[PDB]
Amino acid sequence: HENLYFQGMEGYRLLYPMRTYLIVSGHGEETNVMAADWVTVVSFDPFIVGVAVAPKRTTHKLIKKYGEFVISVPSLDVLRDVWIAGTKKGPSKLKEMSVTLIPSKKVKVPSIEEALANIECRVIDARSYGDHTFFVGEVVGYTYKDYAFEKGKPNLKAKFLAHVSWSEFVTFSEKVHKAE
Amino acid sequence: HENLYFQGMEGYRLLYPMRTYLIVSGHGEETNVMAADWVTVVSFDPFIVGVAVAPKRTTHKLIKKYGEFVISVPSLDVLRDVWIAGTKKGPSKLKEMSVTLIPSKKVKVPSIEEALANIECRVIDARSYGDHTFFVGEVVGYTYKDYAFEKGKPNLKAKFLAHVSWSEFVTFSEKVHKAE
Ligand SMILES: Cc1cc2nc3c(=O)[nH]c(=O)nc-3n(C[C@H](O)[C@H](O)[C@H](O)COP(=O)(O)O)c2cc1C
Ligand SMILES: Cc1cc2nc3c(=O)[nH]c(=O)nc-3n(C[C@H](O)[C@H](O)[C@H](O)COP(=O)(O)O)c2cc1C
């Protein structure tokens, strides 16, 4: 991470590996995508999600402007596009990305066709905790690839993406361990 | 999930598989542990984390009472204890759990010796989003197993735990994919 004055392991790496998602924001010619690890569910009913976004991201400006975002779930197969989303800045990066933008069902921000799922969100809160804003979004729509979630649970063959450390990513083992 | 009136896939399953952690709360005879998937990092500097906890959890009462919690990172090896933490209620469950409580460095809430890491947190915010409270904690200490994070990144041999769907868990593949 940049801004690490005391060299060593960022305390945050203790929570890793973390799932990696894509955050889509803006619409029209302003459409943007960035990578995000710091995403979680914050409510079951209603379904509400949250994402920590640094004010320096173009995505931050676009979420503030439009009050909407989409969480798109990438597979290992689109890692090159995830890397571009997580390294290049602003809407001009899309012309380097293999992904196709498609209309969302409820929000104006588009979805990514290649994504395993697209979760459409309306911002209901934004709080500043340290050096990121935690954008909290009510889920107002979603789409997904049926094979990625067949029988109502994630299908581990779909190669869900996780981030280990800076440029290193993994997927999950297919061997399921049963707790009961 | 219980409280699902319209049968089908909970929208939240679109974010799965998610990492599973343990949340320790209380101290002394009031010490408790529950499982939690809905945990993320919300700030790099200072290091701040957040966890979504339903008001019905004993953990919720204990975090509210003491203003502190610990995020303990479990491996696949302690899955039986994770399952007990995520199914039984309150401090009496610990006598069914294989884990050992040890003192934390900065908070009063104890750490788990068997955990890959223990992240000690002081509550700085608590917001109610739908049916959970998002407890936001400033990190004031941490400990970890050196082999689990050798060379400053997670060691995938340590068998970090992820949750697929209700009773099903996985770990990560050891094959690392490089983005650059
Ligand atoms: C795997 C990965 C995960 C990332 N996670 C986050 C995150 O959770 N929050 C954040 O603000 N930035 C995160 N970043 C950084 C942004 O994706 C990166 O700064 C991006 O260039 C922002 O582009 P934008 O300026 O077009 O919004 C991540 C980067 C990568 C590669
Ligand atoms: C794998 C797993 C993950 C869970 N994640 C959460 C969570 O993120 N937030 C939450 O409030 N409950 C979560 N639960 C439910 C609690 O762990 C469960 O209700 C537990 O019995 C609470 O115990 P307590 O009443 O002693 O706090 C999870 C359960 C499991 C099995």
Side-chain angles (χ1 to χ4, degrees):
Chain A
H1 215 279
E2 201 178 287
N3 263 14
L4 181 73
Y5 309 125
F6 305 112
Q7 171 178 328
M9 101 162 324
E10 297 85 33
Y12 79 68
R13 197 69 67 200
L14 294 175
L15 288 311
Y16 278 69
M18 293 193 81
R19 288 292 307 287
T20 299
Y21 308 91
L22 295 176
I23 305 293
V24 194
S25 59
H27 38 250
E29 302 163 76
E30 269 192 316
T31 299
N32 194 42
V33 184
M34 76 167 209
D37 285 347
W38 296 353
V39 172
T40 198
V41 177
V42 305
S43 177
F44 163 57
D45 198 359
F47 177 27
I48 307 175
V49 292
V51 57
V53 178
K56 79 167 70 266
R57 314 301 181 217
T58 315
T59 301
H60 193 276
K61 297 166 192 72
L62 294 163
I63 292 170
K64 279 288 194 199
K65 182 166 185 169
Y66 296 107
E68 296 181 336
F69 63 93
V70 172
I71 303 174
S72 306
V73 179
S75 76
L76 197 36
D77 288 342
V78 294
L79 181 59
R80 279 172 203 93
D81 293 334
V82 170
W83 192 245
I84 286 149
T87 52
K88 300 304 175 64
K89 316 292 179 199
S92 81
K93 75 178 87 171
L94 270 47
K95 75 220 313 155
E96 286 167 63
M97 288 166 65
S98 170
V99 299
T100 310
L101 303 168
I102 57 167
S104 293
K105 308 283 163 162
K106 202 81 191 310
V107 299
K108 306 161 201 203
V109 176
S111 295
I112 298 172
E113 187 169 64
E114 293 76 12
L116 308 182
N118 288 280
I119 301 135
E120 304 172 24
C121 302
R122 166 174 50 87
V123 176
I124 62 161
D125 209 9
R127 303 282 182 193
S128 182
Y129 301 115
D131 61 13
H132 285 64
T133 295
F134 194 59
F135 286 110
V136 179
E138 185 180 277
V139 180
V140 297
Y142 51 73
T143 51
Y144 59 92
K145 286 186 191 302
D146 258 283
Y147 84 93
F149 300 92
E150 64 160 359
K151 83 185 89 163
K153 53 157 181 262
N155 172 8
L156 295 166
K157 276 163 60 166
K159 290 176 188 176
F160 297 94
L161 186 60
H163 194 196
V164 179
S165 63
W166 192 227
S167 60
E168 302 191 25
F169 296 78
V170 288
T171 196
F172 294 99
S173 162
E174 287 177 62
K175 63 190 85 184
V176 166
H177 296 251
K178 268 244 43 184
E180 75 178 353
Chain B
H1 215 279
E2 201 178 287
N3 263 14
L4 181 73
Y5 309 125
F6 305 112
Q7 171 178 328
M9 101 162 324
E10 297 85 33
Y12 79 68
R13 197 69 67 200
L14 294 175
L15 288 311
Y16 278 69
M18 293 193 81
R19 288 292 307 287
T20 299
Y21 308 91
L22 295 176
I23 305 293
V24 194
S25 59
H27 38 250
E29 302 163 76
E30 269 192 316
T31 299
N32 194 42
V33 184
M34 76 167 209
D37 285 347
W38 296 353
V39 172
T40 198
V41 177
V42 305
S43 177
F44 163 57
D45 198 359
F47 177 27
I48 307 175
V49 292
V51 57
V53 178
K56 79 167 70 266
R57 314 301 181 217
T58 315
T59 301
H60 193 276
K61 297 166 192 72
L62 294 163
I63 292 170
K64 279 288 194 199
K65 182 166 185 169
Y66 296 107
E68 296 181 336
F69 63 93
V70 172
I71 303 174
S72 306
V73 179
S75 76
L76 197 36
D77 288 342
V78 294
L79 181 59
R80 279 172 203 93
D81 293 334
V82 170
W83 192 245
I84 286 149
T87 52
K88 300 304 175 64
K89 316 292 179 199
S92 81
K93 75 178 87 171
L94 270 47
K95 75 220 313 155
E96 286 167 63
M97 288 166 65
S98 170
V99 299
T100 310
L101 303 168
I102 57 167
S104 293
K105 308 283 163 162
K106 202 81 191 310
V107 299
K108 306 161 201 203
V109 176
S111 295
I112 298 172
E113 187 169 64
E114 293 76 12
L116 308 182
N118 288 280
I119 301 135
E120 304 172 24
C121 302
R122 166 174 50 87
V123 176
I124 62 161
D125 209 9
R127 303 282 182 193
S128 182
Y129 301 115
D131 61 13
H132 285 64
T133 295
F134 194 59
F135 286 110
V136 179
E138 185 180 277
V139 180
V140 297
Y142 51 73
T143 51
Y144 59 92
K145 286 186 191 302
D146 258 283
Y147 84 93
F149 300 92
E150 64 160 359
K151 83 185 89 163
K153 53 157 181 262
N155 172 8
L156 295 165
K157 276 163 60 166
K159 290 176 188 176
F160 297 94
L161 186 60
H163 194 196
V164 179
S165 63
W166 192 227
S167 60
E168 302 191 25
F169 296 78
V170 288
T171 196
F172 294 99
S173 162
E174 287 177 62
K175 63 190 85 184
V176 166
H177 296 251
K178 268 244 43 184
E180 75 178 353

